[PDB]
Every structure is written in C-alpha cells, then in structure tokens.
C-alpha cells in the first residue's frame, strides 16, 4: 500500500533520470575520439623495488613531493620510503595489524591508516622529539575502514564497511559530517583536486558524488555489475574512473551524469583492485587480481601496456603528482616503482 | 656538502632494517588464527575458555605462539573483510550442531563459500562441531526429527570409520556423524590437495579445544613442508 506506492514513485524517478540521461547521450566518447592519434606502446620498466614488508601490502599513497611514499602491510607496519634512494624513513608499528588503508597528508606532517579495527589512526611525522607517535584515533565507524584521505592536517574523509563515509575534525576527534547513501561496504574514495567534492564506490555496484561542505549526495552513478573496489578522479575534477569485480573499468562524467566509457577485455575475467590516472588523464592505470596492471587509453578504450612484475594480487597503485612515476603494491609484500 | 644528508638517511635505514629483522622473527614464529564461528554457535564461550572492530587472543601451547582473532562489530557481509585472512594458519569454523530445529544449513552455505573462495583456497579449516551435549539431548528426546531439515538422513548409516564414544547410544552417533559428513562432502568435493578440513566434535567447555588446534596446526605446517619438497 504505502510502501509499495513509494516503490512505484521511485520507479517513475529512476526512469525519468534514465530518460534525462538518454537525452544527453547524443554521441559516445569513442566516436568523439575515433580520430585522435593513439598513444602507441606504453611500456614501463621497474625502476625501484621496495622489500621491507613481511605480509601482504594492502594500500599505499604518494606524498605531494612525488618522492616520499607510505605503504601499509598486514604485518602491522607503516613504512615511509624514499623512492629515489629506496631508503626507509620511518617504520611505524601498528596497534592493529589488520590495516586496509593508508594516507599521506599533503603537508607531509601526518600519515593515517585503518582497517579491521574500525579506527583511523593519525601519526605525527614531524614531532619535536624525533620519533613517530599516534596523534589521534578516530573511533566512530561501526565497520572496517577501507579508505581515508586527508583534506588538510585537520580534516580527513574516511570510508568504511558500515556503508558510510565520514568527515573528521582531527583536533577534536569527532565526525563533522556523515555520508549515508550507500547500501554496501564503501571500498574506496577519491577527493576532487579542489577538495570541495569527493566520490566513493561501494559494494552496491554504485558510485556517489558527495558535497563535502554540505554533506549531501549530489549524484549517483550506476552501470557496474558487481562491487566497486577502486575509484579515482580525473585530473580536472569533472570525471572519475571506477574498478569493479565485474572485470571492467568505467569512466563517468560528472556534468553528463552518466557513464562515458568501459575498459574491459574478454580474456580479463578478474576484478580490478586499484585505479589511477596519469598526469594528463590520457592513461588509466588499473591493477587486477591476476597479478598484473593494465595501462588503458582513457580516450580510446585501448590497452596500451601491461605492468607484469608482481608475484601476487596487485592490491594498490598510485601515480605521483608530477606524473614521473607510478607505484604498485601487491600481496607479494613488494612495492615496484614504474617509469 | 649535500653528500652528508645521504649518509644521515642511510644511517636511519640500517637502524630500521635491524628493527625489522627483530620483528620478522616474532612475526614468522607466531601462527595467526581466524575464529569464524556463527552466532550462538558457542564461539563466544570458546574464547572465554582462554565496539572494537576485531578482538585478539594470545595463548601458547608447548612454547608455540598463537594469535587468534575474532571478528566483532562487523556487518554480516563478509566477502570483503574475510579476504584479509588469506594467509592465516587455519580458520577455526565453529558450528552449533544442535542448532537445527535452519541454522545448520546456513553454516553449511558459509563453509561452502569459504572453502571455494578464490583467496581462501590455500587456507585450511579447523571445524568445531560444537554443542555435542545439546545435540545428544535432542536425539534422545521426541519429535526432533532431524530428517525434516535433512531428508537424506533417513537412508544414512553410521560409517565404519566412526569411533563412537563409550556409553552413548548409536542414535546420537548416527546424528553427529551425519552432520560431520555434510561438511566433509563440501571439503572433499573441491579440495585440490592445497587445504584440508579438520572436523572435531567439541563442547564449549572442552579443554581439548586448545590442544586440538595445536595438533591440527602441526599437521597443516607438516603438509606445507611436504608440499615445498613435492612429496605430498
């Protein structure tokens, strides 16, 4: 009766959105880019190999200097590397070894990490003493933490398995905002370049654009068939890419409010664990369960290269802010810097 | 000269590498266990025998270190966070054998997904068929009718390999062994010699549980070594 009529009202709204999206698809991205010159063979080489971790690596993040990077492994260690010289700068032991995400603050003064403990632990790197200690523990999520990203030294957005995202005040330690749209575990999040918006992918096969300062869900993007494991903004902040367990990557435009391109191959039947764009946005790098990373042409849906060094599941990857290199973490406990 | 800053950085490096070597010794010696009992399966009181997203428990047996983890305060959707335990020594799967009126079928479907998961195919499972004292009381009592929830139980007989407890009537032996072969039918259907299921008839207050895990973990590591030499 009442709930069923609300189920019919939602039916007439998704179809109206479907009609409004169908009316904007006057052309396809492949047809707009059919004339451009392809990129050719993008063959990168492993320039560095980082061999400190014991257990599988779950996450990694580049510092804004494009030189220092932090990685998180299930052995209960945060290691900060000097990618240029392969020297380790810090080896932070974790209270909970089941870490699933790690973040590097843009200022470089803090790193964050979290996992099955449901806590986002903030670590001060530049204390006057010299060592690394826990500065803050954020304890509001009722499920494991899947991703976290600093907005600044005082703000950080976290996504959790409790189907919610949250914006934290690091000094007080309380959630300033909570984002409650997803149905399943939120697996990843990506901040816009201006940090005014962020997007997240969840296990409900959907991605949602969130207004940070307002706390609402601007848009919701469908098209994937299974859980979205990774998400990354386009370098201009007007598009983003998602990687799913359906063995596909998909590009979504914010202003078009619909999918623009699908990156898949028939012999690719494993899920995508991580995605990241190049500095120009022409290349879409995706990590896969088959131990490899495939370089895609974001404009032509072509496969232009493969990174096949790792011996186990590629769990994470990231491109430097200057675009000089891309790092890849894996379940083999190794980080490879490719150029 | 800026060459001294490199000497200061490689100084902190070997300072870290010598600390990671001490952590590599503790990590490689401790055997991690995932306790994945169902609700009201007696999993809570097995830990008791001895808000947070996960609980830990340390215990030594013959000076061997064990770190058992119990997932608490996580949603009922496990297909993501259960992948974090792909490299544990064994998953301890606790089942309330007397939970059938269908809790037992749900435990079977969960065991099926764990056994056939892509990332847990090399992880062994120590199966604790818990609540044996409550199971026997239902079989001796009236109109329990195990055959309703499992019709194939009518044409099932106690196997010869069964070692029945002295004193208990064969009606309970037939019941608890039928439940055991329900899980063995799943484990022996897809096991490619990589992982094995170790079933045990346990109660929540059994002091044998800690020794049972120790003996099965020893068999797991022995088979891992026999697998490195291509002997088994």
């Amino acid at each position, epitope marked *: 009766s009442e709930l069923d009529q609300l*189920r019919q009202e939602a039916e007439q709204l*998704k179809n109206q959105i479907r009609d409004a999206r169908k009316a904007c698809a006057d052309a396809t991205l492949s047809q707009i880019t059919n004339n451009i010159d392809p990129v050719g063979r993008i063959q990168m080489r492993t320039r560095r190999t980082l061999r400190g971790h014991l257990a599988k690596i779950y996450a990694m993040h580049w510092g804004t200097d494009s030189r220092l990077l932090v990685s998180a492994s299930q052995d209960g260690k945060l290691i900060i590397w000097d990618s240029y010289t392969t020297n380790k700068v810090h080896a932070i032991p974790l209270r909970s070894s089941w870490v699933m995400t790690c973040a590097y603050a843009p200022s470089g003064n803090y790193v964050a990490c979290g996992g099955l403990d449901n806590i986002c632990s903030i670590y001060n790197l530049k204390t006057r003493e010299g060592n690394v200690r826990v500065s803050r523990e954020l304890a509001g999520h009722t499920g494991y933490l899947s991703c976290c990203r600093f907005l600044d030294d005082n703000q950080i957005v976290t996504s959790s398995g409790d*189907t919610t995202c949250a914006l934290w005040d690091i000094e007080t330690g309380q959630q300033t905002t909570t984002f409650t749209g997803h*149905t*399943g575990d939120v697996m990843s999040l990506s901040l816009a370049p201006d940090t005014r918006l962020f997007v997240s992918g969840a*296990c*409900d*096969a959907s991605a949602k654009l969130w207004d940070v300062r307002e706390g609402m869900c601007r848009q919701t993007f*469908t*098209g994937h*068939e*299974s*859980d979205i494991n990774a998400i990354c903004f386009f370098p201009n902040g007007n598009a983003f890419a998602t990687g799913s*367990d*359906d*063995a596909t990557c998909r590009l979504f435009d914010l202003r078009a409010d619909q999918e623009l391109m699908t990156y898949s191959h028939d012999n690719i*039947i494993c*899920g995508i664990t991580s995605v990241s764009f190049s500095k120009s946005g022409r290349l879409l790098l995706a990590g896969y369960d088959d131990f490899n990373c495939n370089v895609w042409d974001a404009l032509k849906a072509d496969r232009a290269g493969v990174l096949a060094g790792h011996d186990n599941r590629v769990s994470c990857l990231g491109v430097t802010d200057d675009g000089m290199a891309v790092a890849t973490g894996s379940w083999d406990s190794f980080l490879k810097i490719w150029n | 000269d800026q060459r001294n800053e490199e000497k200061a950085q490689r100084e902190a490096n070997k300072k870290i590498e010598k600390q990671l070597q001490k952590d590599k010794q503790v990590y490689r010696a401790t055997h991690r266990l995932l306790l994945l009992g169902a609700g009201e399966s007696g999993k809570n009181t097995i830990v008791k025998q001895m808000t947070s997203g996960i609980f830990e428990t340390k215990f030594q047996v013959d000076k061997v270190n064990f770190h058992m983890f119990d997932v608490g305060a996580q*949603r*009922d*959707e*496990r*297909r993501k966070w*259960i992948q974090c335990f792909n490299d544990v020594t064994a998953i301890i799967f606790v089942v309330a054998s007397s939970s059938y009126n*269908n809790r037992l*079928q*749900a435990a079977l*479907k969960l065991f*099926d*997904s*764990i*056994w*056939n*998961n*892509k990332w847990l195919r090399d992880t062994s499972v120590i199966l604790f068929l818990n609540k044996q004292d409550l199971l026997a009381e239902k079989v001796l009592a009236g109109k329990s009718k195990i055959e*309703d*929830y*499992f*019709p*194939e139980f009518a044409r099932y007989t106690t196997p010869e390999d069964a070692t029945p407890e002295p004193g208990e009537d064969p009606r309970v032996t037939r019941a608890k062994y039928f439940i055991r072969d329900e899980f063995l039918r799943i484990s022996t259907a*897809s096991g490619d010699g990589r992982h094995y299921c170790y079933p045990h008839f346990t109660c929540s207050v059994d002091t044998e549980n800690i020794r049972r895990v120790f003996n099965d973990c020893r068999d797991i590591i022995q088979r891992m070594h026999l697998r490195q030499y291509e002997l088994l």
Partner: nanobody, 128 residues
Framework: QVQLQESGGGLVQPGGSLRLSCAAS????????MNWVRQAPGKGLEWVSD????????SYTGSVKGRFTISRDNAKNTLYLQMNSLKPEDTAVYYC?????????????????????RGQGTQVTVSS
C-alpha cells in the same frame, strides 16, 4: 543498474503448486550463480535453492528437496522456481538473489540483511 524483480505468488491451498519468476536486468545473467532465499514471518532470511551459471549444478535446502524445482533461462535472463505440493510452512517472501561476483564458485552474503544484489521479493502465502 542491477535490478531483480520477482513475479508470481499469492494465496495457495495447502498442497497446491505455484511458479515464481525472476526478471533479471543490468548484468550478464549467464555469468552469475543465482539463488532463491526466503524470509518467513518473524524468521530471518534462509537460503532455499541455488543454480550454477550453466544450469547443470543445482542444490536445494532439505526442507524443500523433492517439492521445489529451480531453473533458469539464460537467453531470457529469467530465474524460475516451480513450487509443488506447498505446505503452510512455506509461507514467506521469496527473494531472487544474484551471487556477488561473476565466474566464482563461492557465493557470499546472499542471505544477509542488507544484501544489494537481491530483489524486493514476492509474497507467497500457503493457508486454507
């Protein structure tokens, strides 16, 4: 957009028959294992039957084996459930649940409280 809509269901006499249908859209139907789950009044969700992607492997829960028949038409993107000789204990809302990932042998979370890849269910009442 993954959508599962179950058809059929209603009032049946104790001992009668019925056929449930599941109209699937938004995914490659022939890549996923399909399930039927149900929620009796006051009871939790319980798994009823599953069928593999090819349709050759079929499993049933013990309470319905011999009476219920599951089937799928990969060309029509439909999952069927033929329920013969219904009992009063079969009164429940029957849900069509898709397995979370394609090309997988395992099937997690299909009976969870807030599983995403599941329909809204159709009501089946068996009472004279």
């Amino acid at each position: 957009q993954v959508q599962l809509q179950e058809s059929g269901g209603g009032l049946v006499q104790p001992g009668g028959s019925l056929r449930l249908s599941c109209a699937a859209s938004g995914f490659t139907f022939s890549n996923y294992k399909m399930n039927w789950v149900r929620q009796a009044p006051g009871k939790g969700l319980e798994w009823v039957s599953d069928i593999s992607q090819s349709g050759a492997s079929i499993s049933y829960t013990g309470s319905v084996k011999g009476r219920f028949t599951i089937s799928r038409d990969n060309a029509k993107n439909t999952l069927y459930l033929q329920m013969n000789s219904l009992k009063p204990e079969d009164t429940a809302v029957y849900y069509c649940a898709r397995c979370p990932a394609p090309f997988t042998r395992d099937c997690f979370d299909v009976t969870s409280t807030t599983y995403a890849y599941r329909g809204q269910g159709t009501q089946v009442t068996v009472s004279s």
